[PDB]
Amino acid sequence: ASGMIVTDAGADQPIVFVNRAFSTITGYAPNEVLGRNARFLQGPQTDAATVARLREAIAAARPIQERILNYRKDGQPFWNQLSISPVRDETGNVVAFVGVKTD
Amino acid sequence: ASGMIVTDAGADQPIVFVNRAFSTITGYAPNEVLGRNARFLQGPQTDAATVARLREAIAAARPIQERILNYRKDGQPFWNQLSISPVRDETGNVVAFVGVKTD
Ligand SMILES: Cc1cc2nc3c(=O)[nH]c(=O)nc-3n(C[C@H](O)[C@H](O)[C@H](O)COP(=O)(O)O)c2cc1C
Ligand SMILES: Cc1cc2nc3c(=O)[nH]c(=O)nc-3n(C[C@H](O)[C@H](O)[C@H](O)COP(=O)(O)O)c2cc1C
């Protein structure tokens, strides 16, 4: 199974759902992450240019894939092959964002 | 806000998340629907041919949009402009399905 994060569309994209795989991968339980922006997964060695590309894509509701250095709850660095896409209604309104970690 | 349902990919797509708009629209709380296939929203005058097109598209992990008759918890019918899409990882594995109601 691949990790999955779902966020609200607006106002800095707080997490509303993580799948079981997310907790296996990151060591974080759902209650520890709901209502937070996913940027808490980043750490000292995270590439700022990669973070900026995610920021611009999410702001514009553009799909993006990045290999980004993330950090488990226990602090272990892991490479996150991250893909983010908007969820739209048929009018084109953004309803949510979905992020997947590909192992 | 538009209604959104997220399901597992496999084994008859049990619901794993519904947004707040889902509960406003349908009258169901998350604890009433999590772990169930979304077909409980259908009822006696739901169009069988429409349900068959949804079944075939989801089985194939193909996006689909239909206008389908659904029923609130209290039994009141509502027209659901429903769009369902797979969520894939970068290997092409289906991680989840997402369903949206367009007002
Ligand atoms: C649905 C979704 C999932 C995300 N998943 C991750 C993730 O797994 N790891 C990560 O470092 N950032 C993730 N992000 C990105 C951060 O939330 C944030 O958008 C990014 O750090 C850029 O914004 P900032 O410069 O304001 O931090 C995700 C964003 C969204 C919308
Ligand atoms: C993510 C997702 C959301 C769904 N949302 C709805 C819905 O809002 N209303 C509905 O009638 N069916 C919905 N369905 C469809 C049913 O779950 C089911 O796939 C459909 O009734 C066809 O299969 P069946 O013939 O086995 O019932 C959804 C399915 C998925 C995967």
Experimental method: X-ray
Contact across the interface for B19 and A93, Cβ inside 8 Å? no
Range of the domain at A47: 1-103
Closest alpha carbon to A39 in A5, A3, A74: A5
Model resolution, angstroms: 1.4
Report whether residue B26 contacts ligand 2, using a CB cutoff of 6 Å: no
The total of structural domains in chain B comes to 1
Which residues are A71's β-sheet partners? A77
**Amino acid symbol at B6:** V
Instruction: Give the rounded distance of the alpha carbon of B10 from its chain centre.
Output: 14
Residue with CA nearest ligand 2 atom 3: B99
Q: Is A88 helix (H, G, I), strand (E, B) or coil?
A: strand
Q: Name chain B contacts of A17, Cβ cutoff 8 Å.
A: 6, 16-17
Residue showing tokens 């009822």? B43
Q: Is A83 helix (H, G, I), strand (E, B) or coil?
A: strand
Question: What ranges make up the beta strands (E) of chain B?
Answer: 3-8, 15-18, 64-71, 77-88, 94-101
